[PDB]
């Protein structure tokens, strides 16, 4: 037992991280087969980043303007192209550590692991959720651009996130690996800001089931509620609506604990209206919304990856 904010093993992604340098700008790239992926604003200088025309900026570049370092070994760039907000650097060497992979775009509410890196060198790994406002509450310093987010399914890495920027509230914005931003953000220096967020209701319910599996039961109660009447309370507390599909997804967890989904909704309702009254759930004094039903089943049942 126990319940932790658990990341996927990072090895398969570590073998893909490289350093990309263009001018005085250095950031991280992702090396898969003979292509290196990185944020396109690598080609921008300080004054370029104000209001850039990336097509003009890139045509002015040569292959030799891009230095790629894989460890202490240099990769020769033989081609380059722009795909939306990412660069694709064609290198003469295919990465022998290329795992089986996919490029997938995730939904707000879904989680992933982030391998934070600097200068192509992995620093740490942690678990994040895509917020409803399409930001992530990451941990990123200067130089972390090009760090990627991902999930692993058996042996296949599904890349879902490339880090680009920090917004003024200290949260982070980026793209999928096709270079399409998550949310209404651009790779220019404007006054863009996050905009209002909500709590991921289905994930909170998943975590309450995690707690019951792990022995926390004080918040349970005999009452029940209708889906409609729960959603009336959810809206009042800035929680997003619960759907019949969310109820279905919570089915296995319900059946394992013997607590009907709508019964857990009644408990969440009471926790929202009364607070937690000095008690804790899975070591938290707040309702936690960054574990999915998938995450709870994986951790409380024990699936591995090879």
Ligand X SMILES: *CCC(=O)N(c1cncc(Cl)c1)c1cccc(-c2cccc(Cl)c2)c1
Residues lying near ligand X in the complex (CB under 6 A): 1, 27, 39, 41, 49, 140-145, 164-166, 172, 187-189
Q: Is 238 in the site for its own copies (CB under 8 A)?
A: no
Q: Which stretch binds its own copies (CB under 8 A): 74-82, 115-123, 156-164, 217-225?
A: 115-123
- Tell which residue, 254, 244, 245, has the closest CA to residue 297: 254
Query: Which residue of 63, 71, 78, 235 would you call a contact of its own copies, by CB under 8 A?
Result: 71
Q: Binding partner of residue 164 among its own copies, ligand X, none, CB under 5 to 8 Å per kind?
A: ligand X
Instruction: Tell me how far, at minimum, the Cβ of 300 lies from its own copies, in Å.
Output: 8
Instruction: Tell me how far, at minimum, the Cβ of 193 lies from ligand X, in Å.
Output: 13
Query: Which residue of 115, 145, 211, 264 would you call a contact of its own copies, by CB under 8 A?
Result: 115
Nearer of residues 216 and 263 to ligand X, judged by Cβ = 216
Q: Binding partner of residue 284 among its own copies, ligand X, none, CB under 5 to 8 Å per kind?
A: its own copies
Q: Is 27 in the site for its own copies (CB under 8 A)?
A: no
Nearer of residues 16 and 264 to its own copies, judged by Cβ = 16
- Residues with catalytic roles: 41, 145
Nearer of residues 12 and 164 to ligand X, judged by Cβ = 164
What whole-number distance in Å separates Cα of residue 134 and Cα of residue 147?
17
What whole-number distance in Å separates Cα of residue 70 and Cα of residue 100?
19
Exposed/middle/buried for residue 77 (C-beta within 10 Å: 0-12, 13-18, 19+)? buried
What whole-number distance in Å separates Cα of residue 178 and Cα of residue 265?
38
Question: Would you say 71 and 126 are in contact if contact means Cβ atoms under 8 Å apart?
Answer: no
Among the residues of 20-176, which ranges form H helices? 54-59
Q: Binding partner of residue 187 among its own copies, ligand X, none, CB under 5 to 8 Å per kind?
A: ligand X
Among the residues of 26-103, which ranges form H helices? 54-59
Query: Which residue of 66, 118, 134, 230 would you call a contact of its own copies, by CB under 8 A?
Result: 118
> How many alpha carbons fall within 13 Å on the CB side of residue 290?
18
What whole-number distance in Å separates Cα of residue 41 and Cα of residue 49?
7
Question: Would you say 137 and 131 are in contact if contact means Cβ atoms under 8 Å apart?
Answer: yes
Nearer of residues 105 and 298 to its own copies, judged by Cβ = 298
> Phi/psi at 95 (nearest 5 deg)?
-65, 110
Site of interaction with its own copies (CB under 8 A): 1-12, 14-15, 71, 115-119, 121-126, 128, 137-144, 166, 170-172, 214-215, 280, 283-286, 298-306
């Amino acid at each position: 037992s126990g319940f932790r904010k658990m990341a996927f093993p990072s090895g398969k992604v570590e073998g893909c991280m490289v350093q990309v340098t263009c001018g005085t700008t250095t950031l991280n790239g992702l090396w898969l087969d003979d292509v290196v992926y990185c944020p396109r604003h690598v080609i921008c200088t300080s004054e370029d980043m104000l209001n850039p025309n990336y097509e003009d900026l890139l045509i002015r570049k040569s292959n030799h303007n891009f230095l790629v370092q894989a460890g202490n070994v240099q990769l020769r760039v033989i081609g380059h192209s722009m795909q939306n907000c990412v660069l694709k650097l064609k290198v003469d060497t295919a990465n022998p550590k290329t795992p089986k992979y996919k490029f997938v775009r995730i939904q707000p509410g879904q989680t992933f692991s982030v391998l934070a890196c600097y200068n192509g060198s992995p620093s740490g790994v942690y678990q994040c959720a895509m917020r409803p406002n399409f930001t992530i509450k990451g941990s990123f310093l200067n130089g972390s651009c090009g760090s990627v987010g991902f999930n692993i399914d058996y042996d296949c890495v599904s890349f879902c996130y490339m880090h680009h920027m920090e917004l003024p509230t200290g949260v982070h914005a980026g793209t999928d690996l096709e270079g399409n931003f998550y949310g209404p953000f651009v790779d220019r220096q404007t006054a863009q800001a996050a905009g209002t967020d909500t709590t991921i209701t289905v994930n909170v319910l998943a975590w309450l089931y995690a707690a019951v599996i792990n022995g926390d039961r004080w918040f349970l109660n005999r009452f029940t509620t209708t889906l409609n009447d729960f959603n009336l309370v959810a809206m009042k507390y800035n929680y997003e609506p619960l759907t019949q599909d969310h109820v279905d997804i919570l089915g296995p967890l319900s059946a394992q604990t013997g607590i009907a989904v709508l019964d857990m909704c009644a408990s969440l309702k009471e926790l929202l209206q009364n607070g937690m009254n000095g008690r804790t759930i899975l070591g938290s004094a707040l309702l936690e919304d960054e574990f999915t039903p998938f995450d709870v089943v994986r951790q409380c049942s024990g699936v591995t990856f090879q």
